[PDB]
Design an enzyme around this catalytic site. Structure first.
Site, PDB file in Angstrom:
ATOM      1  N   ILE A  41       0.936  -1.198   0.023  1.00 34.62           N
ATOM      2  CA  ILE A  41       0.121  -0.026  -0.162  1.00 34.62           C
ATOM      3  C   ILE A  41       1.003   1.182  -0.148  1.00 34.62           C
ATOM      4  O   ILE A  41       1.803   1.269   0.786  1.00 34.62           O
ATOM      5  CB  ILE A  41      -0.875  -0.005   1.163  1.00 34.62           C
ATOM      6  CG1 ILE A  41      -1.732  -1.100   1.338  1.00 34.62           C
ATOM      7  CG2 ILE A  41      -1.708   1.320   1.281  1.00 34.62           C
ATOM      8  CD1 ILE A  41      -2.552  -1.371   2.642  1.00 34.62           C
ATOM      9  N   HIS A  53      -5.626   4.737  13.274  1.00 31.23           N
ATOM     10  CA  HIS A  53      -5.350   3.231  12.926  1.00 31.23           C
ATOM     11  C   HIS A  53      -6.433   2.858  12.712  1.00 31.23           C
ATOM     12  O   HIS A  53      -6.445   1.693  12.262  1.00 31.23           O
ATOM     13  CB  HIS A  53      -4.317   2.732  14.014  1.00 31.23           C
ATOM     14  CG  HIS A  53      -2.960   3.071  14.011  1.00 31.23           C
ATOM     15  ND1 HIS A  53      -1.750   2.248  13.310  1.00 31.23           N
ATOM     16  CD2 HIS A  53      -2.011   3.920  14.476  1.00 31.23           C
ATOM     17  CE1 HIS A  53      -0.763   2.705  13.286  1.00 31.23           C
ATOM     18  NE2 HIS A  53      -0.947   3.796  14.018  1.00 31.23           N
ATOM     19  N   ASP A  57      -7.170   0.429   9.674  1.00 33.67           N
ATOM     20  CA  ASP A  57      -7.652  -1.123   9.653  1.00 33.67           C
ATOM     21  C   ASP A  57      -8.641  -1.270   8.707  1.00 33.67           C
ATOM     22  O   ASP A  57      -8.933  -2.417   8.000  1.00 33.67           O
ATOM     23  CB  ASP A  57      -8.321  -1.249  11.073  1.00 33.67           C
ATOM     24  CG  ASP A  57      -7.018  -1.753  12.094  1.00 33.67           C
ATOM     25  OD1 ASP A  57      -5.913  -1.696  11.860  1.00 33.67           O
ATOM     26  OD2 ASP A  57      -7.406  -1.952  13.330  1.00 33.67           O
ATOM     27  N   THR A  71      -9.219 -11.648  -7.783  1.00 36.19           N
ATOM     28  CA  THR A  71      -8.296 -12.958  -8.298  1.00 36.19           C
ATOM     29  C   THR A  71      -9.116 -14.133  -8.420  1.00 36.19           C
ATOM     30  O   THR A  71     -10.203 -14.349  -7.814  1.00 36.19           O
ATOM     31  CB  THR A  71      -7.344 -12.917  -7.276  1.00 36.19           C
ATOM     32  OG1 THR A  71      -7.932 -13.116  -5.882  1.00 36.19           O
ATOM     33  CG2 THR A  71      -6.357 -11.787  -7.194  1.00 36.19           C
ATOM     34  N   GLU A  83       1.749  -3.922   5.618  1.00 40.52           N
ATOM     35  CA  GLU A  83       1.101  -3.147   4.666  1.00 40.52           C
ATOM     36  C   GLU A  83       1.356  -3.988   3.224  1.00 40.52           C
ATOM     37  O   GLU A  83       1.323  -3.137   2.139  1.00 40.52           O
ATOM     38  CB  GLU A  83       1.837  -2.022   4.458  1.00 40.52           C
ATOM     39  CG  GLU A  83       3.271  -1.942   4.522  1.00 40.52           C
ATOM     40  CD  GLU A  83       4.008  -0.420   4.329  1.00 40.52           C
ATOM     41  OE1 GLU A  83       3.394   0.494   4.741  1.00 40.52           O
ATOM     42  OE2 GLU A  83       4.989  -0.517   3.868  1.00 40.52           O
TER      43      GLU A  83
HETATM   44  N1  C2E Z   1     -13.670 -18.212 -18.082  1.00 42.75           N
HETATM   45  C1  C2E Z   1     -14.387 -16.771 -17.958  1.00 42.75           C
HETATM   46  N2  C2E Z   1     -15.024 -16.501 -16.674  1.00 42.75           N
HETATM   47  C2  C2E Z   1     -15.418 -15.417 -16.410  1.00 42.75           C
HETATM   48  C3  C2E Z   1     -15.217 -14.395 -17.312  1.00 42.75           C
HETATM   49  N3  C2E Z   1     -15.665 -13.126 -16.545  1.00 42.75           N
HETATM   50  C4  C2E Z   1     -16.166 -13.501 -15.545  1.00 42.75           C
HETATM   51  N4  C2E Z   1     -15.850 -14.840 -15.283  1.00 42.75           N
HETATM   52  C5  C2E Z   1     -16.324 -15.635 -14.250  1.00 42.75           C
HETATM   53  O1  C2E Z   1     -17.122 -14.867 -13.406  1.00 42.75           O
HETATM   54  C6  C2E Z   1     -16.632 -14.926 -12.102  1.00 42.75           C
HETATM   55  C7  C2E Z   1     -16.792 -13.305 -11.448  1.00 42.75           C
HETATM   56  O2  C2E Z   1     -15.958 -12.495 -12.430  1.00 42.75           O
HETATM   57  P1  C2E Z   1     -15.587 -10.942 -12.050  1.00 42.75           P
HETATM   58  O3  C2E Z   1     -16.806 -10.276 -11.436  1.00 42.75           O
HETATM   59  O4  C2E Z   1     -15.082 -10.346 -13.434  1.00 42.75           O
HETATM   60  O5  C2E Z   1     -14.430 -10.989 -11.114  1.00 42.75           O
HETATM   61  C8  C2E Z   1     -13.117 -11.614 -11.570  1.00 42.75           C
HETATM   62  C9  C2E Z   1     -12.507 -10.399 -12.326  1.00 42.75           C
HETATM   63  O6  C2E Z   1     -12.350  -9.210 -11.448  1.00 42.75           O
HETATM   64  C10 C2E Z   1     -10.928 -11.201 -11.831  1.00 42.75           C
HETATM   65  N5  C2E Z   1     -10.164 -11.746 -13.009  1.00 42.75           N
HETATM   66  C11 C2E Z   1     -10.024 -13.139 -12.870  1.00 42.75           C
HETATM   67  N6  C2E Z   1      -9.392 -13.305 -14.362  1.00 42.75           N
HETATM   68  C12 C2E Z   1      -9.179 -12.212 -14.969  1.00 42.75           C
HETATM   69  C13 C2E Z   1      -8.791 -11.886 -16.210  1.00 42.75           C
HETATM   70  O7  C2E Z   1      -8.155 -12.608 -16.900  1.00 42.75           O
HETATM   71  N7  C2E Z   1      -9.087 -10.596 -16.623  1.00 42.75           N
HETATM   72  C14 C2E Z   1      -9.840  -9.563 -15.898  1.00 42.75           C
HETATM   73  N8  C2E Z   1     -10.055  -8.394 -16.149  1.00 42.75           N
HETATM   74  N9  C2E Z   1     -10.124  -9.964 -14.943  1.00 42.75           N
HETATM   75  C15 C2E Z   1      -9.993 -11.367 -14.094  1.00 42.75           C
HETATM   76  O8  C2E Z   1     -10.980 -11.920 -10.802  1.00 42.75           O
HETATM   77  C16 C2E Z   1     -12.396 -12.035 -10.378  1.00 42.75           C
HETATM   78  C17 C2E Z   1     -12.770 -13.305 -10.099  1.00 42.75           C
HETATM   79  O9  C2E Z   1     -12.318 -14.296 -10.758  1.00 42.75           O
HETATM   80  P2  C2E Z   1     -13.100 -15.901 -10.933  1.00 42.75           P
HETATM   81  O10 C2E Z   1     -12.869 -16.350  -9.454  1.00 42.75           O
HETATM   82  O11 C2E Z   1     -12.313 -16.820 -11.889  1.00 42.75           O
HETATM   83  O12 C2E Z   1     -14.515 -15.657 -11.126  1.00 42.75           O
HETATM   84  C18 C2E Z   1     -14.976 -15.266 -12.467  1.00 42.75           C
HETATM   85  C19 C2E Z   1     -15.229 -16.364 -13.461  1.00 42.75           C
HETATM   86  O13 C2E Z   1     -15.643 -17.454 -12.913  1.00 42.75           O
HETATM   87  C20 C2E Z   1     -14.456 -14.405 -18.462  1.00 42.75           C
HETATM   88  O14 C2E Z   1     -14.393 -13.549 -19.301  1.00 42.75           O
HETATM   89  N10 C2E Z   1     -13.948 -15.854 -18.702  1.00 42.75           N
HETATM   90 MG    MG Z   2     -13.892 -16.608  -7.655  1.00 39.71          MG
END
Ligand code: C2E
Ligand code: MG
Ligand code: C2E
Ligand code: C2E
EC number: 2.7.7.65
Length: 172
Positions: A41, A53, A57, A71, A83
């Site tokens: 951070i 603080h 938190d 993620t 941090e």
């Molecule tokens: N195969 C596929 N699945 C999709 C796609 N968009 C959304 N999802 C699905 O929807 C869940 C939530 O997506 P989010 O809100 O974009 O939330 C996502 C997004 O914020 C991010 N993320 C993960 N991988 C990528 C990526 O390759 N590019 C971007 N821009 N964000 C990602 O992490 C968050 C959590 O990811 P997950 O737990 O895997 O969970 C993802 C995944 O299961 C897509 O374009 N292709």
């Molecule tokens: Mg997930």
């Protein structure tokens, strides 16, 4: 109760969970490459000095929740230090790992942290390193730390990559 595998403040797994599992994770990354992303951070001491603080938190708890929500499930977010967060990424190549890093930095910058008396804008500086087979965690974190430091030196709110030549570049 005592739950050594969980940071009480943020609820994330802590240093001990990563330290104990890293060798296993690295051994089982194949056929993918494992990367370590270290996030700090920006000017966090100043946030605590300014707002107190209790608000610090809130920043830590909220950032932890944000990172978890930004993620993939097989890529664990740890609270590694006061941090400092670590995300363990598995990817086909350096560009993919760096895309993960820079998108997370951008998300942090674009989502204010709500607190009782308003909103706080925070940024992170990130360093990313490849973990090569059989390397110990301290070496991998050491290299990511060099990348992150150069990020702080050159303006913060950015993601840096240290490559196979141990040369650091900003990820765009
Ligand atoms: N195969 C596929 N699945 C999709 C796609 N968009 C959304 N999802 C699905 O929807 C869940 C939530 O997506 P989010 O809100 O974009 O939330 C996502 C997004 O914020 C991010 N993320 C993960 N991988 C990528 C990526 O390759 N590019 C971007 N821009 N964000 C990602 O992490 C968050 C959590 O990811 P997950 O737990 O895997 O969970 C993802 C995944 O299961 C897509 O374009 N292709
Ligand atoms: Mg997930
Ligand atoms: N508000 C708050 N700040 C913390 C906490 N842990 C660390 N910090 C902040 O993070 C800075 C670095 O902590 P260190 O690496 O453990 O100086 C500290 C302090 O400003 C915490 O649990 N709560
Ligand atoms: N291991 C790992 N790799 C990451 C992560 N973030 C990005 N990458 C890698 O970088 C490629 C490009 O990501 P992008 O530019 O966000 O471009 C992404 C993004 O626009 C979208 N996408 C994929 N998954 C998600 C998701 O879960 N949420 C959202 N919002 N978008 C997604 O589809 C595009 C293509 O995704 P992919 O074919 O998966 O290809 C992804 C993936 O190989 C990460 O958190 N973990």
């Amino acid at each position: 109760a005592i739950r050594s595998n969980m940071d009480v403040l943020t609820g994330l797994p802590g240093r001990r969970v990563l330290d104990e599992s890293f060798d296993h994770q690295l051994r089982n990354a194949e056929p993918l490459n494992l990367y370590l992303m270290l996030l700090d951070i920006d000017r966090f001491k100043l946030v605590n000095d300014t707002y107190g603080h209790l608000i610090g938190d809130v920043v830590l708890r909220t950032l932890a929740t944000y990172l978890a929500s930004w993620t993939r499930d097989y890529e664990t977010v740890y609270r590694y230090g006061g941090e400092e967060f670590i995300i363990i990424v598995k990817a086909a190549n350096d560009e993919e790992a760096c895309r993960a890093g820079v998108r997370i930095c951008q998300l942090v910058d674009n989502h204010a942290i709500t607190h009782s008396e308003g909103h706080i804008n925070i940024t992170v500086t990130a360093g990313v390193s490849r973990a090569f087979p059989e390397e110990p965690l301290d070496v991998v974190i050491g290299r990511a730390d060099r990348a992150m430091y150069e990020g702080k030196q050159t303006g913060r709110n950015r993601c840096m990559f240290i490559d196979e030549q141990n040369v650091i570049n900003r990820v765009l």
